């Protein structure tokens, strides 16, 4: 097998080259110059951080825990980078018997990275950032499965290969008009660089899964946390975008698929700079109280539609 090794090393570079965009686009959004000194346009700085944070930075926590803690950055990468495997792409690595089920299960398993980092420090200061990270993720897992079901019943089955073929004339944004707007919010269930987000950034509280971790484990967390942002951006570009298929020419698909994802890649960092944090209590009131009755009403609506007019795979 060569394909897996050709989907980790160039992918870790994409999370590395993200650091440019994380302060270049975000910089111009705030009217400030980002990467400039290090490279021609600061292009040598993202690869410099790998030399900076791993080879020279040494920390291990004080009071600590036993085997757990250092188990958590292994759980961070080894569950978020595996998410690249079930992706349909032009051609998938081992096409699943049911596609999106593996995508939804491993995403919830990726939440454990911020959960086990609560017991990284035995001291109570770190676990407050963990307990906040529970509720900021636990509620949004409800709608994430429901809004999927309304799209999946509209087009094909759980298999991700069928989701490419179903969009031949028009996108799925237009039939699922309120549901597409939900997937700019529901995608930010995992601790991502955003305005909605979770307990990961500083601002008000101490940094979750970062105050306990070093540099080396803490550096490994960013290579997983920012990796999930690309993952949700690609996953939205499958469920809601498509444009064309073309099995004969893979070259025409690969260029067209990347532009659609890159426009969404900018959009989350667009969200991050623009708006403040939603608060621990009031994020639980955005969904559950307000958005859950809306999504279920649309779920009720999407059950009737294949019966009203023929729509069965």
């Amino acid at each position: 097998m060569i394909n897996i090794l050709m989907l980790i090393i160039p992918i870790l570079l994409a999370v590395a080259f993200l650091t440019l965009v994380e302060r270049k686009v975000l910089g111009y959004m705030q009217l400030r110059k980002g990467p400039n000194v290090v490279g021609p346009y600061g292009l040598l700085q993202p690869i410099a951080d790998a030399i900076k944070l791993f080879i020279k930075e040494p920390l291990r926590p004080a009071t600590s825990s036993a085997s757990m803690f250092i188990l958590a950055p292994i759980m961070a990468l080894g569950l978020a980078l595996t998410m690249w495997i079930p992706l349909p792409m032009p051609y998938p690595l081992i096409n699943m018997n049911l596609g999106v089920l593996f995508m939804l299960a491993m995403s919830s398993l990726a939440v454990y990275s911020i959960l086990w980092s609560g017991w990284a420090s035995n001291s109570k200061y770190a676990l407050i950032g963990a307990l906040r990270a529970v509720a900021q993720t636990i509620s949004y897992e409800v709608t994430l499965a429901i809004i999927l079901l309304s799209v999946l019943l509209m087009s094909g089955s759980f298999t991700l290969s069928t989701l490419i073929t179903t969009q031949e004339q028009m996108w799925l944004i237009l039939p699922a008009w309120p549901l597409a707007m939900m997937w700019f919010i529901s995608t930010l269930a995992e601790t991502n660089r955003a305005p909605f987000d979770l307990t990961e950034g500083e601002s008000e509280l101490v940094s979750g899964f970062n105050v306990e971790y070093a540099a080396g484990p803490f550096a490994l967390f960013f290579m997983a946390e920012y990796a999930n942002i690309i993952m949700m951006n690609i996953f939205t570009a499958i469920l809601f975008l498509g444009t064309s298929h073309n099995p004969h020419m893979p070259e025409l698909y690969t260029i067209n698929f990347t532009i659609k994802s890159l426009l969404l890649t900018m959009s989350f960092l667009w969200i991050r700079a623009s708006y403040p944090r939603f608060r621990y209590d009031q994020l639980m009131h955005l969904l559950w109280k307000n958005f859950l009755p809306l999504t279920l009403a649309l779920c009720m609506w999407h059950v009737s539609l294949p019966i009203l007019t023929s729509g069965i795979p």
Binding site: T166, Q169, L174, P175, P306, I312
Partner: protein, 69 residues
């Protein structure tokens, strides 16, 4: 003659005024586009599903036609 700091009036900068104004969407206009996109959305989607039926029966026909398998 002694020279000091001079005063300038002209327009007096215009202090305290609401620059915020509503643009593009009004209220009733965006809902006509919103439901209009939905009506166009479901109608175009189900036509492909009916086109899928042409393939669906024909794909399963291959198993019925092949009995030496």
């Amino acid at each position: 003659x002694x020279x000091x700091x001079x005063x300038x009036x002209x327009x007096x900068x215009x202090x305290x005024x609401x620059x915020x104004x509503x643009x593009x969407x009004x209220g009733y206009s965006m809902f006509a586009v919103g439901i209009g996109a939905l009506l166009f959305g479901y109608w175009s989607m189900m036509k492909w599903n009916r086109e899928r039926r042409r393939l669906q029966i024909e794909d399963f026909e291959a198993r019925i036609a092949l009995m030496p398998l």
